[PDB]
Amino acid sequence: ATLKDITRRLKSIKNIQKITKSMKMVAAAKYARAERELKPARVYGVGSLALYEKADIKTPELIIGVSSDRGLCGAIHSSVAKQMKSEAANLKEVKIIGVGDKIRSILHRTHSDQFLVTFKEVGRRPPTFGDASVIALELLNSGYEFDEGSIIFNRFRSVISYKTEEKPIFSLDTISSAESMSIYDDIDADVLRNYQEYSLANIIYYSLKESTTSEQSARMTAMDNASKNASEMIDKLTLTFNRTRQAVITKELIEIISGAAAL
Amino acid sequence: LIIYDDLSKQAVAYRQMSLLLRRPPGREAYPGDVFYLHSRLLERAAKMNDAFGGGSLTALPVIETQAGDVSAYIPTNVISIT
């Protein structure tokens, strides 16, 4: 421990304490907006799936990861990547789509050749149905007529709690017509080709609206922890400095007096 | 090849003697020539030419540091010699 070293770490933790403090505030505004924009978007998602739950849909014989770009949000990108790699080995042909750069980097090296499309700038600007539609367009423009898929995302619960959730997407138009669909009448083969396409854009948007609410909340959290872990570390080293300042003055003085009291 | 295990303990011994000889202390209560103490010794370990015998004396002195501080006064004082 030295006066040069001590103050260097005090100079830099008073940085982190503040840098982290504003990153809590930045995320705190983005949470409060994402919490309001989720309130309707939930009802929207509720009404979107209210058909696949009321009438059972199976498949006789596509993985979508939803997170963001900006990290430091605790364990948002890492919780969905765990449940993606869980199904990457458990299954059958598996083709992956990752929304948010932090899926192209966290679970890439392992499944580098199993990529279909990648999406950036997620979590910078609050998501829209317009963003979900670009996700819907690119999926249907690719020559991958998928049998069945599942979308994995972070569902919001509260300021601190969230859970990684799967939702199966029966978006194969060949799978749209099952024995449970025989209950329904007055349908076209190519009117489901319209409905299935749109109900896909809904659930993508819903998962995206849940994610950016669950993401900014735990970044607000992680940074409120980190800024007040630095607040504690400042208050700890500062009085460690005083110890070492007073002791250096005292010790430099004994060193003189000892030399004066020998002549 | 001579090993001094260790020279820091010799310093404590030298500090004892010098202070007991009523000779004033310097930095860290060690006498003012605490550098001269080891430098004198460690210079004698050397490599002689063929004209003087061809022989040699190697030195591996040992220093104990507290809490990993090599930048400390006595450690650097010996580093500055070897």
How far is A220 from A146, CA to CA, in rounded Å?
Answer: 38
**Is A256 near chain B, with CB under 8 Å?**
no
For residue B50, what are the CA distances in angstroms to B42, B53, B54, B55, B58? 21, 5, 4, 8, 17
B24–A262: do the CB atoms touch at under 8 Å? Answer: yes
The domain made up of A1-25+223-263 has a fold known as Helix Hairpins (1.10.287)
Residues of chain A with CATH 3.40.1380.10: 26-222
In chain A, ranges of CATH 1.10.287.80 domains: 1-25+223-263
Candidates B22, B26, B71; nearest CB to A259: B26
Label residue A20 exposed, middle or buried (CB < 10 Å: 0-12, 13-18, 19+): buried
- Give dist(CA A166, CA A147) in Å, integer: 17
A74: left (phi over 0), alpha (psi -120 to 50) or beta: left
The CA distance from A193 to A174, in Å, is 10
CB burial readout A218-234, b (16+ within 10 A) else e: bbbbbbbebbeebbebb
Indicate the residue type of A203: I
Question: What technique was this entry resolved by?
Answer: X-ray
List CB contacts (< 8 A) between B25 and chain A.
Answer: 255, 258-259, 262
What tokens appear for A242 in the block? 């005083």
Specify the fold of A26-222: Pyruvate Kinase; Chain: A, domain 1 (3.40.1380)
Cα A58 from chain centre: 29
Q: Is the distance from CB of A214 to CB of A154 less than 8 angstroms?
A: yes
- How many angstroms separate the CA of residue A239 from the nearest CA in chain B? 20
Instruction: State residue A142 phi and psi, 5-degree precision.
Output: -80, 140
Residues on B contacting A at a C-beta cutoff of 8 Å: 19, 22-29, 71
Across the interface, whether the CB atoms of A255 and B29 are under 8 A apart is answered yes
| Chain A (226-255) residues lying within 8 Å, Cβ to Cβ, of chain B | 255
Using a 10 angstrom Cβ sphere, with 0-12 exposed, 13-18 middle and 19 or more buried, the burial of residue B16 is exposed
A212 in Cβ contact with A70 (< 8 Å)? no
**Does B5 appear as a known binding residue?**
yes
B12 in Cβ contact with B71 (< 8 Å): no
Region for A22 from its dihedrals, namely left if φ exceeds 0, alpha if ψ lies in -120 to 50, beta otherwise:
alpha
* Interface residue A263 vs chain B (CB under 8 A): yes
